[PDB]
Amino acid sequence: MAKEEELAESSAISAKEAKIEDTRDKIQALDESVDELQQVLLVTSEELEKLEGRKEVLKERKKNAVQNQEQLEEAIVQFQQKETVLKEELSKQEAVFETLQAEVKQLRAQVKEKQQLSNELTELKIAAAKKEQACKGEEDNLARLKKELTETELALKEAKEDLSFLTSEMSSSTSGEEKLEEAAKHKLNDKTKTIELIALRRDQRIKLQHGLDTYERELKEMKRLYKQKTTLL
């Protein structure tokens, strides 16, 4: 009977040796659970800096577009500036044509008016073509002066060219900004939260791995005192 409950004490060794084999299977459930999470974190991390890179593309396209937008606004201002001058000048030079042919009609008449000697009236005939020719070209020069306004006013419709260009830097970016900045900030929270699971689960297992440190040593004596007493009797 004395030994009958010597071994009935060794039954607890089976409990501890079972609590071990039950506990080591509690840790590895998490050393691959974590492993599954580290393969998720890998994926989540890839999407962010792919997205964060895609966000950098529009920054290259606009800052290249801004150099194209501010450039055309200069042209838009420069062309309207020339157009205001040419249309003023053409009108100003058109006035010379008006004053031109007003002097020529009086010239032919006045020289003929005195004629109603004659050489002094033909001295106006010389003054006729003198006034006529000096103001014949100005009637034709301002005509071609309008041709520079036939190029500028149309160039102002190459300013509309910027707006058409711009809306492809907007609705391609604005539809892209809601496609990038919405997702890029949203893809991050999944990344950080996955790291927090791992950090906890790793800490959750080290508390059992420290539990295992005690449990695995307690057996070495349980199996020694029993072994040293088994050699006694």
Sketch the domain layout of the chain as residue ranges: 11-230
Alpha-carbon distances, residue 125 vs 58, 112, 116, 119, 132 (angstroms): 74, 9, 14, 9, 10
Both structure tokens of 232: 């006694």
Alpha-carbon distances, residue 213 vs 11, 18, 25, 37, 218 (angstroms): 22, 15, 15, 26, 9
Alpha-carbon distances, residue 194 vs 32, 51, 53 (angstroms): 14, 18, 22
Q: How far is CA 144 from the centre of its chain?
A: 47
Cα(119)–Cα(12) distance, rounded to whole angstroms? 152
CB count, 10 Å around CB of 229?
Answer: 13
* Resolution, expressed in angstroms to one decimal: 3.3
CATH architecture of 11-230: Orthogonal Bundle (1.10)
Q: What are phi and psi of 8, to 5 degrees?
A: -65, -15
Contacts 24+ apart (CB under 8 A), 64-70: 65/165, 65/166, 65/169, 68/162, 68/165, 69/162, 69/166, 69/169
